[PDB]
Design a protein around this ligand. Structure first.
Ligand SMILES: CC1=Nc2ccc(C(=O)N3CCN(C(=O)NC(C)(C)C)CC3)cc2C1(C)C
Length: 121
């Protein structure tokens, strides 16, 4: 399975699954600062799933590693803002992160394999 391009639709389908998860709702849109006016003192680089889907559809990711870095930022940014490791939203982020890591592993493996095969000779 050496298709160098296959990651892109694979990542589109996984983002569709994440948007279907109730656990995604808080992380779907860029954080609103009216409810959280201190956010940009705590979080240097805001990220959300709509930004990730738009970046993908724009043709502005070169690899599934770059998309994975952005998605992991959504979860590190969630971990950075939680006052309690027993926060509802933080707990939502931990479950969605486990779901995401479970599904992205084959995408990364298949892509890195395809690129090694491309440079075999
Ligand atoms: C994505 C996210 N992930 C999490 C995780 C936890 C919370 C959360 O429950 N809190 C309480 C309220 N906070 C506040 O800013 N208040 C202070 C007292 C610090 C001033 C801190 C975050 C909010 C979010 C969002 C931004 C939606």
């Amino acid at each position: 399975s050496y298709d160098i391009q296959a990651w892109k639709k694979q990542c589109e389908e996984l983002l569709n699954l994440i948007f279907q998860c109730e656990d995604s709702e808080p992380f779907r849109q860029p954080v609103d600062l009216l409810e959280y006016p201190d956010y940009r003192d705590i979080i240097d680089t805001p990220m959300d799933f709509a930004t990730v889907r738009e970046t993908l559809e724009a043709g502005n990711y070169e690899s599934p590693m770059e998309l994975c870095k952005d998605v992991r930022l959504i979860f590190s940014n969630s971990k950075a803002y939680t006052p309690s490791k027993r926060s509802r939203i933080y707990s939502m982020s931990l479950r969605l992160s486990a779901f995401f890591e479970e599904h992205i592993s084959s995408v990364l493996s298949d892509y890195k394999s395809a690129l090694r095969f491309h440079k075999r000779n």
